[PDB]
Design an enzyme around this catalytic site. Structure first.
Site, PDB file in Angstrom:
ATOM      1  N   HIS A   1       0.808  -1.259  -0.064  1.00 59.71           N
ATOM      2  CA  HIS A   1       0.091  -0.016   0.047  1.00 59.71           C
ATOM      3  C   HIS A   1       0.897   1.319   0.025  1.00 59.71           C
ATOM      4  CE1 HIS A   1       0.130  -0.357   4.709  1.00 59.71           C
ATOM      5  NE2 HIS A   1       0.107   0.739   4.285  1.00 59.71           N
TER       6      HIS A   1
ATOM      7  N   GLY B   1       2.898   6.449  10.305  1.00 62.47           N
ATOM      8  CA  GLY B   1       4.228   6.313   9.808  1.00 62.47           C
ATOM      9  C   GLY B   1       4.763   5.083  10.382  1.00 62.47           C
TER      10      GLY B   1
ATOM     11  N   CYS C   1       3.713   1.756   9.689  1.00 60.64           N
ATOM     12  CA  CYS C   1       3.550   0.830   8.691  1.00 60.64           C
ATOM     13  C   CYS C   1       5.023   0.552   8.027  1.00 60.64           C
ATOM     14  CB  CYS C   1       2.841   1.327   7.512  1.00 60.64           C
ATOM     15  SG  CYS C   1       1.124   1.236   8.210  1.00 60.64           S
TER      16      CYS C   1
HETATM   17  C1  LIG Z   1       0.443   2.903   7.800  1.00 65.62           C
HETATM   18  O1  LIG Z   1      -0.028   2.832   6.506  1.00 65.62           O
HETATM   19  C2  LIG Z   1       1.630   3.938   7.796  1.00 65.62           C
HETATM   20  O2  LIG Z   1       1.796   4.327   8.845  1.00 65.62           O
HETATM   21  N1  LIG Z   1       1.731   4.547   6.551  1.00 65.62           N
HETATM   22  C3  LIG Z   1       2.541   5.796   6.564  1.00 65.62           C
HETATM   23  C4  LIG Z   1       1.977   6.800   5.750  1.00 65.62           C
HETATM   24  C5  LIG Z   1       1.776   6.999   7.146  1.00 65.62           C
HETATM   25  C6  LIG Z   1      -0.554   3.118   8.599  1.00 65.62           C
HETATM   26  C7  LIG Z   1      -0.233   2.983  10.307  1.00 65.62           C
HETATM   27  C8  LIG Z   1      -1.550   2.893  11.000  1.00 65.62           C
HETATM   28  C9  LIG Z   1      -2.100   4.343  11.464  1.00 65.62           C
HETATM   29  C10 LIG Z   1      -2.477   4.576  12.765  1.00 65.62           C
HETATM   30  N2  LIG Z   1      -1.867   3.394  13.450  1.00 65.62           N
HETATM   31  C11 LIG Z   1      -1.503   2.361  12.601  1.00 65.62           C
HETATM   32  O3  LIG Z   1      -1.198   1.398  12.897  1.00 65.62           O
HETATM   33  N3  LIG Z   1      -1.817   2.342   8.163  1.00 65.62           N
HETATM   34  C12 LIG Z   1      -3.005   3.031   8.004  1.00 65.62           C
HETATM   35  O4  LIG Z   1      -3.243   4.156   8.323  1.00 65.62           O
HETATM   36  C13 LIG Z   1      -4.040   2.229   7.392  1.00 65.62           C
HETATM   37  C14 LIG Z   1      -3.766   2.246   5.770  1.00 65.62           C
HETATM   38  C15 LIG Z   1      -4.372   0.912   5.160  1.00 65.62           C
HETATM   39  C16 LIG Z   1      -3.928   0.925   3.719  1.00 65.62           C
HETATM   40  C17 LIG Z   1      -4.132  -0.376   3.269  1.00 65.62           C
HETATM   41  C18 LIG Z   1      -4.462  -1.159   4.156  1.00 65.62           C
HETATM   42  C19 LIG Z   1      -5.642  -0.928   5.112  1.00 65.62           C
HETATM   43  C20 LIG Z   1      -5.648   0.460   5.499  1.00 65.62           C
HETATM   44  N4  LIG Z   1      -5.416   2.608   7.600  1.00 65.62           N
HETATM   45  C21 LIG Z   1      -6.405   3.352   6.787  1.00 65.62           C
HETATM   46  C22 LIG Z   1      -7.507   3.645   7.335  1.00 65.62           C
HETATM   47  C23 LIG Z   1      -7.913   3.389   8.784  1.00 65.62           C
HETATM   48  C24 LIG Z   1      -7.156   2.930   9.743  1.00 65.62           C
HETATM   49  N5  LIG Z   1      -7.368   3.006  10.825  1.00 65.62           N
HETATM   50  C25 LIG Z   1      -8.226   3.588  11.295  1.00 65.62           C
HETATM   51  O5  LIG Z   1      -9.293   4.192  10.857  1.00 65.62           O
HETATM   52  O6  LIG Z   1      -8.123   4.037  13.017  1.00 65.62           O
HETATM   53  C26 LIG Z   1      -8.803   3.897  14.049  1.00 65.62           C
HETATM   54  C27 LIG Z   1      -9.070   2.626  14.446  1.00 65.62           C
HETATM   55  C28 LIG Z   1     -10.202   4.068  13.437  1.00 65.62           C
HETATM   56  C29 LIG Z   1      -9.312   5.182  14.912  1.00 65.62           C
HETATM   57  C30 LIG Z   1      -5.690   2.385   9.030  1.00 65.62           C
HETATM   58  O7  LIG Z   1      -4.891   1.943   9.665  1.00 65.62           O
END
Ligand SMILES: *[C@](O)(C(=O)NC1CC1)[C@H](C[C@@H]1CC=NC1=O)NC(=O)[C@H](CC1CCCCC1)n1cccc(NC(=O)OC(C)(C)C)c1=O
Ligand SMILES: *[C@](O)(C(=O)NC1CC1)[C@H](C[C@@H]1CC=NC1=O)NC(=O)[C@H](CC1CCCCC1)n1cccc(NC(=O)OC(C)(C)C)c1=O
Lengths: 306, 306
Positions: B41, B143, B145
């Site tokens: 992703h 961040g 991930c």
């Molecule tokens: C990860 O991709 C990341 O850190 N990417 C770098 C650009 C910043 C994050 C890390 C998450 C965010 C907060 N804690 C973590 O563990 N991952 C995401 O943000 C998720 C992206 C994924 C993309 C494809 C796989 C499925 C989602 N993501 C997206 C949308 C929502 C959430 N979680 C969420 O909505 O939060 C709470 C539970 C609802 C309040 C998510 O992790």
């Protein structure tokens, strides 16, 4: 989100751990530049330990009565001195993995990471707090002496603890990296015991802020309190008195959450008087006191789940 | 003595962490030999995430649409492939800090160490368990991930987890290092939720053994139980059924303490039926299930405090 007892990454410290042997006693030491630090009781045998005279035990050693091993490599000792309860062993090689570092004496209530080591080999890492009674609730077996405690700021390792002994209650006592004990303890086998401990009030409050930053508000209430009314309740529950300095430290967290410190104190007083009633805060059923305000800002979102 | 949620020393893993950027998205990757692993992703923008077609999003990238940074040093990407939910980026340099390593898929109930990283920079280390519902109760911000989970055996790093996402309850979901999700989760923004979890019975029992090895026996009793009578009580308390395999795993600890497994089960059944009555076990007021039998033997004395 989530909240965990997190340790600092241990890499910079792993690269400094060595084995120090003197006759029959093997323990861990710390190799920065061309010095190796270790507990001075490495020169003691069993019987020596009831009433050691270290000055007297050390004068009858030479440089070559100490064997230092960095992994496979033997290091040659070319100098030795006692500093308080440590030995400084001068060694022929400068540690090439020496990080930027400092030696600090941490204050009761502050937290650090311990790298548990055996025979100069790192076995595990965990976070703990210096208790008000100057002990730590560590996890340490025979051979763990010389294991260090540290904090990391940017690229700089702040060493603050070296392990020396376990007290009767199964808690741990040791020195800063100048060899001064934390607490009233001495490096001899005598009848010494941990003083009575108290809960670290400032940390419990920091952790309630953590729980609110993380989006939990159940334990809040509409009351406030004076410092003095809080402290009357604190004393009865074996909590440390709160001071204006501790109120000032909680400012940033207070602002991030818009909960005033004395309001959070009203919440805590209510939690102390009424228990939690099988309820949890950040997954715990007791009030946690081994996170500082700094640990909470470090680990938590800078934006509240409002 | 003492007992702490201990992580593995993180050094071997710190030396493998990198930053991976694709347009606007930066996350962490893992650099072993001449490959960098990261969540697929990283090629997605915000809107892409409702319903990404990865095959379709990836075909329109080149080697040079990926920026990889090891500290200061940019690494040149010279190859790319998708493996399940990861990308494999072939890179012009072999990581000189590559440890001996393996990729394993850990089983629910097993524990590992997480190195929380941001922008390829390690920030903290903590131990956690793969929950029966295939989530982890991590501590992870935007961040994080690409952050990995691992175990260390002698000098060999067993990578088992890469972080991908947070679920609605604030728990974490991710993949093994072949890019297969743990649990039924997919790497798209949809209405997916953690299944109902259960307590890890085998671990609670291992931790009661830990408490006895450490010299505490208060919660023991004169009763025994059948497996089936235990399991009727287990089901009512949302504990996993115990099996003969789990009884066999607790053998070594059973022998070290001379407490039969079904006797410890009688103790647990009594703890579940009667609560703890403001009493503690190894400092806790709840029954801990994030230590395996292996974690207890690793950390505890091989000789009981009888
Ligand atoms: C990860 O991709 C990341 O850190 N990417 C770098 C650009 C910043 C994050 C890390 C998450 C965010 C907060 N804690 C973590 O563990 N991952 C995401 O943000 C998720 C992206 C994924 C993309 C494809 C796989 C499925 C989602 N993501 C997206 C949308 C929502 C959430 N979680 C969420 O909505 O939060 C709470 C539970 C609802 C309040 C998510 O992790
Ligand atoms: C340390 O010296 C060490 O590991 N040395 C290497 C040769 C093995 C140990 C580590 C202790 C032991 C168990 N956990 C630890 O933290 N330190 C000691 O064994 C103490 C030696 C000191 C020598 C000079 C300073 C004062 C003692 N030591 C000696 C005697 C008794 C205890 N503790 C104790 O009796 O255990 C419990 C609480 C009573 C059951 C002690 O730490």
């Amino acid at each position: 989100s989530g909240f965990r007892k997190m340790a600092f990454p241990s890499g910079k410290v792993e690269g400094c751990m060595v084995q120090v042997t003197c006759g029959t006693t093997t323990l861990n030491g710390l190799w920065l530049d061309d010095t190796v630090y270790c507990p001075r009781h490495v020169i003691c045998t069993a019987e020596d330990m009831l009433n050691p005279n270290y000055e007297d035990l050390l004068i009858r050693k030479s440089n070559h009565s100490f064997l230092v091993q960095a992994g496979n490599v033997q290091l040659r000792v070319i100098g030795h001195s006692m500093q308080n309860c440590l030995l400084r062993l001068k060694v022929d090689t400068s540690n090439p993995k020496t990080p930027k570092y400092k030696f600090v004496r941490i204050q009761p209530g502050q937290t650090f990471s311990v790298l548990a080591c055996y025979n100069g080999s790192p076995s595990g890492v965990y976070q703990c707090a210096m208790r008000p009674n100057h002990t730590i609730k560590g996890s340490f077996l025979n051979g763990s002496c010389g294991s260090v405690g540290f904090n990391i700021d940017y690229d700089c390792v702040s060493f603050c603890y070296m392990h020396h002994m376990e007290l009767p209650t199964g808690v741990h006592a040791g020195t800063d990296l100048e060899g001064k004990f934390y607490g009233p303890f001495v490096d001899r086998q005598t009848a010494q015991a941990a003083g009575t401990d108290t809960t670290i009030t400032l940390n419990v409050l920091a952790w309630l802020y953590a729980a609110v930053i993380n989006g939990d508000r159940w334990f809040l209430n509409r009351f406030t309190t004076t410092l003095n009314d809080f402290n009357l309740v604190a004393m009865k529950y074996n909590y440390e008195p709160l001071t204006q300095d501790h109120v000032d430290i909680l400012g940033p967290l207070s602002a991030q959450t818009g909960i005033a410190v004395l309001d959070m104190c009203a919440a805590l007083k209510e939690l102390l008087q009424n228990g939690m009633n099988g309820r949890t805060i950040l997954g715990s059923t007791i009030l946690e006191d081994e996170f500082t305000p700094f640990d909470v800002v470090r680990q938590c979102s800078g934006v509240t789940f409002q």
